[PDB]
Amino acid sequence: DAYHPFPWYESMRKDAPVSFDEENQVWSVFLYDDVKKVVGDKELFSSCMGNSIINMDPPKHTKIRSVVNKAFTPRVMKQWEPRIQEITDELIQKFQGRSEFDLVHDFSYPLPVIVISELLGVPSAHMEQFKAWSDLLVSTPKDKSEEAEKAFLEERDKCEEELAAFFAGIIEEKRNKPEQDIISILVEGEKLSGEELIPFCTLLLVAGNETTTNLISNAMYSILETPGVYEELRSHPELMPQAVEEALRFRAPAPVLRRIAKRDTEIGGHLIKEGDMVLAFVASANRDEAKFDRPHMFDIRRHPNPHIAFGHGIHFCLGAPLARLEANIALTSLISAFPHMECVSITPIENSVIYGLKSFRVKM
Ligand code: HEM
Numbered sequence: 001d002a003y004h005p006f007p008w009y010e011s012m013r014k015d016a017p018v019s020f021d022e023e024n025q026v027w028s029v030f031l032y033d034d035v036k037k038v039v040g041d042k043e044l045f046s047s048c049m050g051n052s053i054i055n056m057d058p059p060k061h062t063k064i065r066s067v068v069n070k071a072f073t074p075r076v077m078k079q080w081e082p083r084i085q086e087i088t089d090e091l092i093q094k095f096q097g098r099s100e101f102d103l104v105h106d107f108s109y110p111l112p113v114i115v116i117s118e119l120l121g122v123p124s125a126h127m128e129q130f131k132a133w134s135d136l137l138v139s140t141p142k143d144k145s146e147e148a149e150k151a152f153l154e155e156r157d158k159c160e161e162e163l164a165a166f167f168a169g170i171i172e173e174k175r176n177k178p179e180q181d182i183i184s185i186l187v188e189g190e191k192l193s194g195e196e197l198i199p200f201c202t203l204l205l206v207a208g209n210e211t212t213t214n215l216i217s218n219a220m221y222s223i224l225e226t227p228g229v230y231e232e233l234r235s236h237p238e239l240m241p242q243a244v245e246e247a248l249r250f251r252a253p254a255p256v257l258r259r260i261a262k263r264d265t266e267i268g269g270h271l272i273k274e275g276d277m278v279l280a281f282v283a284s285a286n287r288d289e290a291k292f293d294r295p296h297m298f299d300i301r302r303h304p305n306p307h308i309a310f311g312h313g314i315h316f317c318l319g320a321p322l323a324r325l326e327a328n329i330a331l332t333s334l335i336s337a338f339p340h341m342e343c344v345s346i347t348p349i350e351n352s353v354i355y356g357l358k359s360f361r362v363k364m
Contacts, residue, residue: 003348003357005255009284018268026277027267032288032308034268038259038280040313045259045278047315050160052196052203054315061314067190068200068318071182077321079180080119084326087114088333096337100344103334103360104217111330112212116204119322121170121181133163138210140351160202167201168194208319211253214349214356215323216330219247221360223331224343226298230335233300237332243300244327248286249307250298255283255355257311282308283355340364 012019012030019028029035038045042058049055053064070076091111095101113134114127122130136159141152170183171194178184182204186197223229223243233239257280261272272278286307287295310317317323335341344361 001348002350003346003355005283005355006287009281009287013284013288018270020270024277026279027270027272028279028281029267030281030284030288031268032285032291035280035282035285036308036312038267038278039257039282039308039311039315042314044262044265046262047259049258049260050199052199053318054203054207058314064192064196064200065314065318067192068186070190071185072318072321074321076180076182076185077325081325081329083118084115084329085333087111087118088329092333092337098364100361100363103220103362104213104357105359107334108213108216108220108330108360111216112209112326113205115322115326116208119182120167120201120204121174121179121183123170123173126166130166133159133166134205134209137205163202163205164198167198171197204319207317208323210354210356212319212323212326214253214354215244215247215327217357217360218251218253218355219244219327219331220334220362221343221346221357222247222250222298223335224341224362226300229298229300230341233331234335234339237336239300240328240332241324242303242305244324244331245305245307246298246300246302247327248309249292249302249305250286251355252283252286252307252309253354253356254309256281256353282311338364 009030012028017029017031018034019030020026021028029038046057047055047061048057053061053068056064088111091107091114095106101107110131113131117127117130136155139152139155141149167183171187174181174184174187178188183197183201186192186200192200223233229243233243259278259280261274261276261278264274265272267278285291286309289295291306292302310320310323341362341364344363345359346357346361347359349356349358
């Protein structure tokens with residue numbers, strides 16, 4: 001099913017590592033070296049596809065990225081660890097007494113949304129409206145592709161335009177009364193306009209909510225499926241940062257990244273024409289035998305672990321430290337609260353560009 005793409009990746013790495021789809025006119029790249037080159041080579045492969053920095057090339061990207069780095073420094077993450085912990089503990093309290101529960105609905109789905117709202121300075125008396133927007137951001141164009149996509153895109157514009165106005169309001173607020181949130185930090189050289197700041201805030205939801213949820217779900221799944229690891233982590237919570245890196249390698253939430261060739265060039269010995277679209281499967285790269293010893297094994301001690309779950313190069317995930325922090329806290333906290341846990345059932349997300357779970361039911 002959609003939760004089990006790895007055999008197919010393995011077949012492509014072996015049989016068709018650089019492949020052209022004649023219907024969609026797109027290349028797919030599956031080997032670690034090829035994927036990493038495509039993703040990192042800003043000179044040869046463009047990210048230009050209101051999407052903010054993730055779809056900008058230099059020099060525009062350079063200018064904005066350098067300004068927003070200030071919002072994710074180790075100092076800021078340290079500052080927020082307390083609050084992420086409190087949020088995590090509060091979520092857990094709601095299902096602490098149950099013999100069965102859905103890890104997604106009850107825990108991994110709400111957690112990143114609550115965290116980012118507080119990090120974006122969303123006033124607490126406006127939390128539901130914000131959550132509602134975040135839900136709309138990950139709604140499917142369903143169903144399906146029957147030219148009703150025109151509608152979906154309209155409801156997406158609607159949602160985004162409502163987010164824009166909302167962020168506009170918070171931005172003005174933080175100008176008058178700054179606090180310790182990302183918006184305060186970016187409105188305090190290095191001075192973005194609202195036309196750049198607003199699309200950036202929306203990107204944080206788009207780039208960070210569902211991926212972080214899916215990281216947490218996928219990490220717990222990998223942990224449960226691997227004998228002894230749950231108990232080892234419970235006894236030795238200091239192993240968690242490394243376990244998180246292995247979960248990123250093993251079950252990356254964002255399996256595929258797009259680029260456009262800026263010039264005719266070769267990838268893995270295949271000529272990619274200027275203007276051609278390329279899909280770089282970081283999920284496949286992360287399983288590539290040529291780069292990782294025994295890639296099929298989920299080894300929480302794997303070190304070094306040069307996965308590309310967060311990308312590579314100029315667009316390397318801005319939220320990496322926050323995702324790492326959220327996952328460490330979420331996972332350590334979950335495993336501490338529960339002596340034993342077993343997988344009952346999963347329902348996979350059915351979406352090419354996404355790897356994760358719609359539901360993850362576990363029992364004590
Ligand atoms: C496990 C969780 C996450 C994963 C796996 C992930 C993955 C990625 C990847 C692969 C890229 C590179 C895109 C490319 O090269 O085309 C990226 C970029 C980005 N991510 Fe993340 N992400 C995660 C969480 C987050 C969070 C929590 C945030 C913010 C709150 C965030 C914000 C961003 C932004 C703003 C970019 C664009 C950076 C740039 O273009 O310079 N991500 N992410």
